[model samples]
Target: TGDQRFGDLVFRQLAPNVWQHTSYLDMPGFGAVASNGLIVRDGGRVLVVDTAWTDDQTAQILNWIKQEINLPVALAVVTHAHQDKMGGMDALHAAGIATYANALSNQLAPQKGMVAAQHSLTFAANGWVEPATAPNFGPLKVFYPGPGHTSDNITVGIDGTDIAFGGCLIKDSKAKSLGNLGDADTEHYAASARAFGAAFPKASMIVMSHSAPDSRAAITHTARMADKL
Candidate 1:
């Protein structure tokens, strides 16, 4: 049921309750690149992970959610500071989506000419938040496995499910290159990717930002790429 398209954006179902949305950005020298985000639903509430590449894309996502999903987004989590991750942040904010991110991401947002998220995740360090712990944000556990793509990149794992959205830190299995390494923490990239896999050992489906959703091996592949770096 996730085969719908909105302009240059598309939403595809990954699991029973997990849907992924991809948006494009006209990157110089790179042509058009796709960035992924998540639309997670738990009961009557919804949570979006990462915004689209632009405000217009975000607004389209909102409309799609309203017409297709027909659920209210209770919370949001922006995984990192890159423009592809939070460029549509204002659209989410303007729509009254209570978005949150790591405190460090808030600090890094300004560097990208983006506004800080209105809310900050309660736990920003290397840890996990179970669905039972986070009242409204349940069924989704956020994890920070040190730094990699950015100093604040974090992964979100859905409780009782084998799904983990690996932000931009872990690359998809099909990724030939590491994509953007300009803001990478090369020294700790391997460790972070390793830690992410270790954190969600049983995650059968690990979703990535720039590529299609893949299995846990994607994290391993990411570590291997990091080792090469």
Candidate 2:
């Protein structure tokens, strides 16, 4: 039912109010990578999980949110420090939308030629627990279970449901390799995926940064690939 489209940006309804957007990246030798982002509605406001491919694409999603959903974009969460995830930091910041990222992402953004996000999460030191009343509908929890794709990668859990955003740590079913390891922790990759699985054993729908939704199999696949490294 989520076959909705907006130019190069596409959105698929995953749940009652949760949607997944797909964008593309043209890798030199790898051809194309279908990157993804998540959108959740909390009453009249919205929360963007990632910013898609670029600022222009990010703006397209924002316009869609405003014209279609008719709500202010409350926040944008950068799951990791990659360009595909936080490349739209400038756009969101200029639009007055608050953006949050983990400490590692904030630290790596500048080095990756992107600006640091306005907000930072220290989940590594203090894992966050859901509040009694979730701000945007159900509770949204952030955790740094461990490092897989990157030392600072984190996951977001939608409390009360089996939905988890595993970022780049988890690969698509078609992924043969670990995808990108320019910043990966190969030695701890398996342990990190295992930790994430242990944290959310019931996640029926695990969203990866560059693949379709999957179950625990994706995590296991990631771990197996890490072991081969």
Candidate 3:
């Protein structure tokens, strides 16, 4: 199946073996905005980086993977505790897919009434939850350089591509400021971004959660904006 749109969700190819799903949803104070996620294909298995804004939108993503890639979505990694990232974790879990998030994210999600993913990747497990490191996840690499957009934001690096799923941690170039600071650590934002830059210096494409994907400029722009605050 080629790029398809269902309801408010749209699925399209971002790069070889990498696809993106965009969902339009209303934010509490931000009105309607597009949130994005990635699907990375590894052999006969697929990995979902983040989920759509709702259960229905997330279902569309799963159906596409099953029909187009003809592979099971072996794993899903939530980038943070926000609604846009983990809003559909329950849906995926219901579909019998294994969903994971950093321990800090899981710990904080319930505070905001957000549902936590099924599995937990603890910080001590040397996985996605750890800071300033990238750990293998079957074929993709999970990175948690530091907390910027949220206390537990993480990035995913595709094994054979320069594309990095920066989630909310990396901003689009046009973003004048860190979009949402309600759950952010402004003091440590720039340093966290710098750590990501150091970790994925060759990330030619950065997929942000809110806007269209861009290059390393997204990372630098986010860092510069945070440096001012």
Candidate 4:
């Protein structure tokens, strides 16, 4: 139910076939630190967006999937390549779950992008994981609404569900300022938010990969934040 707010992770029944995952880690961090997911029931299969961090956390979420329906994840979506966002891809990959990261992220990703900023290629060359090598999970078709939180941000849209996983493009509910200007272009960020508004006219519910869900107020707040930048 939309009325309920779970601890760190809220469960929302947005539409008949769609559900949302809103993290309790609101305020400063906005809980975008962990793996957040948006689950969709497509006929008999389940599609997951942004798997959690540790194997334990990932397993816990999958356990919930087993109880709900016996469908092995038909698809797995990684909104971006940040460790928290893509760290659990290995688990899903081992389970034979097809996975995909932001396609545009690969295209426009800067030489010093977030994943690149860490200088992770040393012992973790493959740890960063490339989107090109990712397997296509289910028939889920996703779109990249430019970039806001980072140049690599991607929104996962589950067709009829009318639900979009807006990643970090929409900031935390109580967020009054921006964090990590490491890779953001204020001009691009503002444009991306407006583009998201224009792209999904039918979106009834949006869950950020981090932070709580927001109605029009959050959107306006985020857009305003970008403008002030």
Candidate 5:
């Protein structure tokens, strides 16, 4: 299941035991907290997906994790390098937690950091903290069927479980339009969604960094949202 700091923000379940933080708030200086992170349990081990945007938020989430589960973060998968997803890297790293992002995402992360960190990004904090152990887990199977959202946007699928982390690839059905296409190629984004779509035949649940956890409706709704954009 997901952590507790965002209990009202997301929903939790038993079987897959996947939890996601979805409700958002507008921060004065920071951009927004519209997105979320995923948590999964396997063999009593815990893995968190995507980092948040601040030290306090991450700290609260970590505290919740400690209260609910006994396992340390075995792995942290960053679906992309957006300020919200990568901003908490330093916090996690400082806690001795290792994280991994797509290689292209790793490259794009530094570039994005240069722009945002230099001026204190809308959703990022002061001073960029380099990630701890960002290894490349390329050649992803299923969900990350092809390049799409952004060159850095990649889908993360976990084995032995039917859960997948779609990051910003899927928007909450209640969202307006596709949000922003500034970093996405309309054509490629569509193609990437299709490729990702093909991998969900067996998926029992879909998790996103924003919005809420949905059934197969998320797959169809997210596709429709981008297609309309």
Candidate 6:
């Protein structure tokens, strides 16, 4: 039951209550590229981190969770505003799922022709945010380590576990460069990664949005690539 598939979306149980869901997006010249996200279970409810590349794909994920897992999504957090991260706004809203976006992400979404989440959140501290009382999605902490993949990019860490969703901020283990810089704040990318490492010091397995889960060293690897750029 820990391993399964939902059409083109694959679900792999990473921990007792955490699963990684992967879908694909077809890039113009790069062909079809994989995108990853997380589905975390909290008692009777599920917490979704990011979504599939499009509305239909994400609906498939919702269906799997509802039919197979037999749980309702309590909340969802989109790591950024890009299509690979938050493209399924239509599906999420259609399902009446309450989703949230970082305040900065809400500001940046319109420029990219993507709708922002219904709610906006600000970090409780300098790039660190704990789950707010109202949303109440269990033990998830969000970190905004400045700007790397995108200025609004954030990372999600589940409490009582060693896993963290680095989204598009941390590179996949096979990444050779910083990947895309079209909407990146190149100058501060390295520093932001360093902050991420400090924030999630206990994270040993950091999940990536574009590739397989990687060891904690990915944070350093990403910084090194940014330095070279």
Clashing pairs in 4: 8-23, 8-24
TM-scores for every predicted model:
0.93, 0.90, 0.90, 0.72, 0.75, 0.94
Report lDDT (Cα) of residue 56, candidate 2: 85
What tens-digit string does per-residue lDDT give for candidate 6 at 1-229? Answer: 5778788889999999899999988879888888999998888899999989899999998998998679888889999989988889889999989988898888988988988988887876688764562268577888888888888888889998999888887885567877668888888898888788888899998998877889977988888888776
lDDT of each: 0.84, 0.79, 0.81, 0.59, 0.59, 0.85
Whole-model lDDT, model 4: 0.59
- Cα displacement (angstroms), candidate 3, residue 24, comes to 1.3
All candidates: CA RMSD in angstroms? Answer: 2.1, 2.7, 3.0, 7.3, 7.7, 1.6
Instruction: Kindly list the per-residue Cα lDDT of model 1 for residues 1-229, writing each as its tens digit.
Output: 7577877789898878888999998968979888888998888978999999889999988888888779998988889888888899999989888878877888889988997898766553456643343456777778888888987888888887888888788888767887788998989999999988988888998888888888777988889989988
Runs with alpha carbons beyond 4 Å of true place in candidate 6: 130-134
Worst 10 residues of 2 by lDDT: 129-138
What TM value does model 2 have? 0.90
Tell me the number of clashing residue pairs for each predicted model. 0, 0, 0, 2, 4, 0
User: Among these predicted structures, which one has the highest TM-score?
Assistant: 6
Better of 2 and 3 by lDDT: 3
After superposition, the stretches of candidate 3 with alpha carbons farther than 4 Å from their true spots are: 1-3, 27-31, 124-136
As a whole number from 0 to 100, the lDDT of residue 148 in candidate 6 is 83
Q: List the residue pairs that clash in candidate 3.
A: none
In candidate 5 the C-alpha lDDT for residue 109 amounts to 74
**What lDDT tens digits, residue by residue, belong to model 2 across residues 1-229?**
4568886788888777788888777779978777888888877778888887788888888887776688888887888898888888888888898888887789999988988888777753444523321233344577786777888887887766678888888885557899889988888888888777778877899998877798778888888888887
Q: Pick out the ten consecutive residues of candidate 1 with the lowest summed lDDT.
A: 124-133
